[PDB]
Ligand binder design. Structure first.
Ligand SMILES: O=C(/C=C/c1ccc(C(F)(F)F)cc1)NCC(=O)N1CCNC(=O)C1
Ligand SMILES: *[C@@H]1O[C@H](CO)[C@@H](O)[C@H](O)[C@H]1NC(C)=O
Lengths: 32, 577
C-alpha cells in the first residue's frame, strides 16, 4: 500500500467528526 | 432515624413538585420522549462494564460458577440501588452532587467521590474505545492486518517474535501497543495510538456537546445497533464449528470454585460496574423525568435486560471460545497424526479438548486476540471485523455518555466556570483535560498502567460510594419519608421486597463484600503480566511484581475518592465550630 488504509479511514472519520463539531457549534449559537 | 434538622428547607416541597414540571420548562433539561431516557439507561446499564467486563470474569473464574453469584447479587444488591438512584433523582430534581448535599450538607463528599470515580472510569473506558477504533480502522483490508506476520531484512524470514508467538499476538503487542518489557520502561508516545485517542474523545464531544439535547438523539443509533449486531454474532457464533462444545463448557461449572471468596468479590464489584451504579449519571438522568414517572417499573425493566444481556454475551463469547479450542484440538491432533506418518510411511503433543477450553486469557485478549483470530478464520472476515468493532464502539460511546454526565453535571453544580459561558465550553475542556491525561496509556508501557485500574484500586471506591448512598437515603434522609415520596410519585408505597433490601439485606451485603474485599484482594500482592520476547518459555506468561512506587498510585486513584466522603464531612463539622 502506498498509503496505509487505516490513515485513509481515520482521515474520512475525523473529517466527518470535525464538520459535525463545527455544524453543532454554529447551530447552538444560531438557536435564538 | 439520624437527627437531620433543616432537611425540609433544602429539598423541594411535595406540593411544589406538582407546580414545577410546566414552570421549569427552561433552566433544567427535559427528555423529549420516555424512549430517549430508556435508551440512555439501556446504554449505561448494558454498555461496556456489562458487555466488556462480565464475559472476561466468566472465563477468568468459571463459565457458570460466576453467573450464579452475579445474578444473586444483581437481585439483592443491584435492583435495590438501581431503584433508589432512579427514585432519589426523580424526587429531588438534582444531580448526584445536588442530591447528597441537599439530604445533608456534610454529604457533599459523596457527590465529589462519584464525580472522581466517573472521571476515572471514563478515562479507562475511552482508552479501550481508542484501541477499538484502531482495530476498526484496520478492518477495511481483505487480508485483515493481524492475519499474517511481517518478515526479515532478507525478506525470507518471518519476524522471530511473530514466529515464536502469532500474527494476532504480534499485531496486538507490537503493531498496536509497541509494548515495553515492564512498567518502569516508559518509552515514549505511540503517535498512531495518540491519533486514535483524539478520534475517541472528539466523537464523544460531537455526541455530548449539549448534554441530553445531543446525547438523547445519539442513543437512537448508539443503544440500538449494538444489540442487533450482537444478535447477528449470536447466530454466527452458534453455527461456527465447535461452538456447542464451548456453550456446554460454561453451563458445566465446577462448584469447588463457587466456594472461593474471589468469585464472590468480583461478582460483588461487577454488579456496580454492570449497572453503572455509584457513578451518579443515573441520578442526573432520572432527575430530568416527570415527577409522576414510574421509576420502580423502569428499574425492574433495566435490571431484567441487564441480567438477560449478561447471560446472552457469555453465550456469544463461549461459542467463539469453543470454536478456538476445537480448531486447536484438531490442529494439535492433525500434527500428532503428521509426526508418525512422516516417521513410518517420534515427538507428540498432549492435547485433550478440556485443557484448551479452560485456558484463561489475560488482559484484553478476549477482544483483540480470541475474537480477532476467529474472525480471520470466517469468510468475509473484513465484514465481521467491521461489525464487531462497530458494535463495541457504539457500546463504548453509550457508556461514555453516562460517565461524561457524571463529571459535567457536578462541575456545573460546583459553579466553577462562568455561568455566562455555554455548556459546550465546559464539555470541551473536560474532553481536552481527559484527552491529555490519557497520554499515559499511549506510552510504550501504557497497557501496564491501564491494568492498574483493573486492580482493586478501580473497585474499593465504588463499593464505599454505593454503601453510603444506601445508608444516607435510608438513615440520614429517612426511608419513611422516602416511601411517602415514592407513593406520591407512582401511587403505591414500595412493597416488602424493597423494604427488606433497603433497610437490612443490601447494606449488610455491601458491608460484608467491602470487609472481605481487604481480607483477601488488598492483602494479596499486586502482580501484572509482561510481554518480553527475551523471556524463556517466551509466548508463555511471566507475571512479576509492580515496583513500590505504583503503591503511591493505587493509594490515590482509590483512596482519594473514598476519603473525599469523610474528609469533606469532617471539614464541614469543623467549619460549623
Ligand atoms: O476482553 C474483554 C472483553 C471482550 C469481549 C466482550 C464481549 C464480546 C462480545 F461477545 F460481545 F462480542 C467480545 C469480546 N474484557 C477485558 C476486561 O474486562 N478486563 C477487565 C478485568 N481484567 C482485565 O485485564 C481485562
Ligand atoms: C517502538 O518502541 C521502540 C522503543 O521505544 C522505538 O524505538 C520504536 O521507534 C517504536 N516504534 C515501533 C514501530 O516499534
Amino acid at each position: 500500500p502506498p498509503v496505509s488504509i487505516w490513515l485513509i479511514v481515520f482521515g474520512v472519520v475525523m473529517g466527518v467528526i470535525v464538520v459535525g463539531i463545527v455544524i453543532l457549534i454554529f447551530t447552538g449559537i444560531r438557536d435564538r | 432515624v439520624l437527627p437531620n434538622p433543616g432537611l425540609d428547607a433544602r429539598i423541594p416541597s411535595l406540593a411544589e413538585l406538582e407546580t414545577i414540571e410546566q414552570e421549569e420548562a427552561s433552566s433544567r433539561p427535559k427528555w423529549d420522549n420516555k424512549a430517549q431516557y430508556m435508551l440512555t439507561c439501556l446504554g449505561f446499564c448494558v454498555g461496556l462494564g456489562n458487555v466488556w467486563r462480565f464475559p472476561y470474569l466468566c472465563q477468568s473464574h468459571g463459565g457458570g460458577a460466576f453467573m450464579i453469584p452475579f445474578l444473586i447479587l444483581l437481585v439483592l444488591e443491584g435492583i435495590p440501588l438501581l431503584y433508589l438512584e432512579f427514585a432519589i433523582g426523580q424526587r429531588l430534581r438534582r444531580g448526584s452532587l445536588g442530591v447528597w448535599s441537599s439530604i445533608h450538607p456534610a454529604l457533599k463528599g459523596l457527590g465529589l467521590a462519584s464525580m472522581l470515580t466517573s472521571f476515572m472510569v471514563g478515562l479507562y473506558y475511552n482508552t479501550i474505545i481508542s484501541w477499538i477504533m484502531w482495530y476498526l480502522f484496520n478492518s477495511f483490508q481483505e487480508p485483515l492486518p493481524w492475519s499474517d506476520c511481517p518478515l526479515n531484512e532478507n525478506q525470507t524470514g518471518y519476524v522471530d517474535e511473530c514466529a515464536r508467538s502469532s500474527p494476532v499476538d504480534y499485531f496486538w503487542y507490537r503493531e498496536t501497543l509497541n509494548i515495553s518489557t515492564s512498567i518502569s520502561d516508559s518509552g515514549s508516545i505511540q503517535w498512531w495510538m495518540l491519533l486514535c485517542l483524539a478520534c475517541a474523545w472528539s466523537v464523544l464531544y460531537m455526541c455530548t456537546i449539549r448534554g441530553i439535547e445531543t446525547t438523547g438523539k445519539a442513543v437512537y443509533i448508539t443503544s440500538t445497533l449494538p444489540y442487533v449486531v450482537l444478535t447477528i454474532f449470536l447466530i454466527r457464533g452458534l453455527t461456527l464449528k465447535g461452538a456447542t462444545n464451548g456453550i456446554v463448557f460454561l453451563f458445566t461449572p465446577n462448584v469447588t470454585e463457587l466456594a472461593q471468596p474471589d468469585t464472590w468479590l468480583d461478582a460483588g464489584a461487577q454488579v456496580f460496574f454492570s449497572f453503572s451504579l455509584a457513578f451518579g449519571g443515573l441520578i442526573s438522568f432520572s432527575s430530568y423525568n416527570s415527577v409522576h414517572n414510574n421509576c420502580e417499573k423502569d428499574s425492574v425493566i433495566v435490571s431484567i435486560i441487564n441480567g438477560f444481556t449478561s447471560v446472552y454475551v457469555a453465550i456469544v463469547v463461549y461459542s467463539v471460545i469453543g470454536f478456538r479450542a476445537t480448531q486447536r484440538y484438531d490442529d494439535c491432533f492433525s500434527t500428532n497424526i503428521l509426526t508418525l506418518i512422516n516417521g513410518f510411511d517420534l515427538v507428540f503433543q498432549t492435547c485433550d479438548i478440556n485443557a484448551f477450553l479452560s485456558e484463561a486469557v489475560e488482559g484484553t485478549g478476549l477482544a483483540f486476540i480470541v475474537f480477532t483470530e476467529a474472525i480471520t478464520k470466517m469468510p468475509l472476515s473484513p465484514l465481521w471485523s467491521v461489525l464487531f468493532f462497530i458494535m463495541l464502539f457504539c457500546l463504548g460511546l453509550s457508556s461514555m455518555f453516562g460517565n461524561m454526565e457524571g463529571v459535567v453535571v457536578p462541575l456545573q453544580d460546583l459553579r466553577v466556570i462562568p455561568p455566562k459561558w455555554p455548556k459546550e465550553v465546559l464539555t470541551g475542556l473536560i474532553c481536552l483535560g481527559t484527552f491529555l491525561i490519557g497520554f499515559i496509556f499511549t506510552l510504550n508501557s501504557g497497557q501496564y498502567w491501564l491494568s492498574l485500574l483493573d486492580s482493586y484500586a478501580g473497585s474499593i471506591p465504588l463499593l464505599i460510594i454505593a454503601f453510603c448512598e444506601m445508608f444516607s437515603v435510608v438513615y440520614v434522609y429517612g426511608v419513611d419519608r422516602f416511601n411517602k415520596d415514592i407513593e406520591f410519585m407512582i401511587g403505591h408505597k414500595p412493597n416488602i421486597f424493597w423494604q427488606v433490601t433497603w433497610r437490612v439485606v443490601s447494606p449488610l451485603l455491601m458491608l460484608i463484600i467491602f470487609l472481605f474485599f481487604f481480607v483477601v484482594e488488598v492483602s494479596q500482592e499486586l502482580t501484572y503480566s509482561i510481554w518480553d520476547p527475551g523471556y524463556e518459555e517466551f509466548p508463555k506468561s511471566q507475571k512479576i511484581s509492580y515496583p513500590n512506587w505504583v503503591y503511591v498510585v493505587v493509594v490515590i486513584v482509590a483512596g482519594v475518592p473514598s476519603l473525599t466522603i469523610p474528609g469533606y464531612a469532617i471539614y464541614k463539622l469543623i467549619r460549623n465550630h
